[PDB]
């Protein structure tokens, strides 16, 4: 019989287990025997307190480096304001030591944990690339609780070196099975930001994770978009509990908050899943998340059922992660077929946007060719357009099975006249659908102003396979 941890703050970790069903079902995975042994996770942030009494026993120097100062020791820089506490708080969520009389426990409390010190300085393209590409045959899972500014007017993503690091990681990392990249979807809720305008979360190579409050609501800081995959608990209002973890100066905190706390919990659950089947590819892991995540009792006004019967929301993706279900399904999982890519250039001529523009196109999805796709994974609409006030635009894409993805919602603070330059808006909401048939793109002006512009390119890019499907939910 499994004995649950005895750490002094474990009873306050409401999100790991309980009788109330408002949890991530992590104790069920522990009782199946999975605690993270043999898995390596690295936190890409402002450093890690490698001598913390709740981290030292799991610390891994092979998973660590200091990119800011060009040395191997990722110890954070100590200041009166404790500004460099952020990475230590994230690490304890993943792999804080269990049954040692100190603070609480990590989701994967027997995993090995490291940190890359890379945010305490100017964060260039080269700095990102060196961190994402660190020791890729030793580190299994990378966790990133940072990104472009959440001011609600930025459009930005990885530059050339960083994008090259993503492709090298999923292609050759982890013995050719592919590095696992976990991303926090963002804190821009108060600015009405869209996480499709962030190239890191919007990438197909990252699992982008959103947040829910203890009572099951959309937190004030949450950003909605179609590229989010799933959700873990984090903070909310002052009557709702928060996240318990290791803090700077060898302390314990019960007040870790925001999008920053959601990605590390997902990284820990993925660590338990890899222990249950070390042969899973980067794409296998996203399939497992899609099939096992749970919508129930998360409140949102946009829940919709897609073409294969799964509920999906722009605030939550496919719902809350379920650790017990993840490790169970992983054990006898059959590896997916190699990934196919079908490129469809839609437009024959430019189109004026004006007040509203609708573009309809029936596709065969590369029928008769080696890259024929009958079973979709990610889909992208790569758009080039000019417009006089970018934040007045709303953009939607409808799949042949009738699933309406919001690619872009209105952004009141985005006054840019720069438009979009081949920006690859991504949706997860049509996963496992057949993409043959009519696709519909809608672009509209959400304001009463007399705005003007032109759509000059629309490439529909489909990813997936032609085998292995399941009876729709």
């Amino acid at each position: 019989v499994y004995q649950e941890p005895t750490d002094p703050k474990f009873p306050q970790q409401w999100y790991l287990s309980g009788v109330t069903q408002r949890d991530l079902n992590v104790k069920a995975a522990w009782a199946q025997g999975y605690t993270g042994h043999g898995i390596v996770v690295s936190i890409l942030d402002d450093g890690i307190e490698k001598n913390h009494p709740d981290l030292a026993g799991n610390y891994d120097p092979g998973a660590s480096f200091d990119v800011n100062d060009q040395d191997p020791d990722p110890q954070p820089r100590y200041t009166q304001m404790n500004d460099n506490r952020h990475g230590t708080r994230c690490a304890g969520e993943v792999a804080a030591v269990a049954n040692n009389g100190v603070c609480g426990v990590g989701v994967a409390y027997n995993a090995r944990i490291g940190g890359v010190r890379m945010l305490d300085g100017e964060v260039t393209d080269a700095v990102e690339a060196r961190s994402l590409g660190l020791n890729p045959n030793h580190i299994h899972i990378y966790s990133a609780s940072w990104g472009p500014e959440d001011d609600g007017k930025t459009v930005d993503g990885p530059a050339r070196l960083a994008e090259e690091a993503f492709f090298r990681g999923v292609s050759q990392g982890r013995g050719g099975l592919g590095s696992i990249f976990v991303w926090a979807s963002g804190n821009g809720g108060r600015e009405h930001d869209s996480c499709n305008c962030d190239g890191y979360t919007n990438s197909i190579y990252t699992l982008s994770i959103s947040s829910a409050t203890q009572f099951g609501n959309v937190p004030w800081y949450s950003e909605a978009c179609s590229s989010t995959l799933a959700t873990t608990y984090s903070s909310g209002n002052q009557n709702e509990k928060q996240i318990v973890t290791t803090d700077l100066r060898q302390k314990c905190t019960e007040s870790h908050t925001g999008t920053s706390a959601s990605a590390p919990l997902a990284a820990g659950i993925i660590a338990l899943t890899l222990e249950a089947n070390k042969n899973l590819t980067w794409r296998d892991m996203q399939h497992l998340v899609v099939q096992t995540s749970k919508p129930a009792h998360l409140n949102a006004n946009d829940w919709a059922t897609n073409g294969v019967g799964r509920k999906v929301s722009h605030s939550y993706g496919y719902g809350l992660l379920d650790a017990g279900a993840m490790v169970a399904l992983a054990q006898n999982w059959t590896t997916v077929a190699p990934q196919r890519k079908c490129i469809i250039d839609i437009l024959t001529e430019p189109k004026d946007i004006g007040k509203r523009l609708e573009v309809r196109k029936t596709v065969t999805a590369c029928l008769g060719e080696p890259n024929h796709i009958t079973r979709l994974e990610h889909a992208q609409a790569r758009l080039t357009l000019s417009y006089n006030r970018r934040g007045d635009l709303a953009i939607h894409l409808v799949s042949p099975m009738g699933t309406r993805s919001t690619l872009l919602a209105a952004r009141p603070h985005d006054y840019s006249a720069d438009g979009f330059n081949d920006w690859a808006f991504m949706t997860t909401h049509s996963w496992d659908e057949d993409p043959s048939g009519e696709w519909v793109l809608e672009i509209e002006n959400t304001s009463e102003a007399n705005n003007y512009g032109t759509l000059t390119k629309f490439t529909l890019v489909l990813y997936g396979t032609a085998s292995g499907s399941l009876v729709p939910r």
């Binding site: 942030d45 402002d46 952020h86 945010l119 100017e122 964060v123 260039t124 990102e128 609780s145 940072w146 990104g147 472009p148 500014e149 959440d150 920053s260």
Partner: peptide, 5 residues
């Protein structure tokens, strides 16, 4: 700044 926590 280019990147934020």
């Amino acid at each position: 700044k280019r990147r934020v926590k």
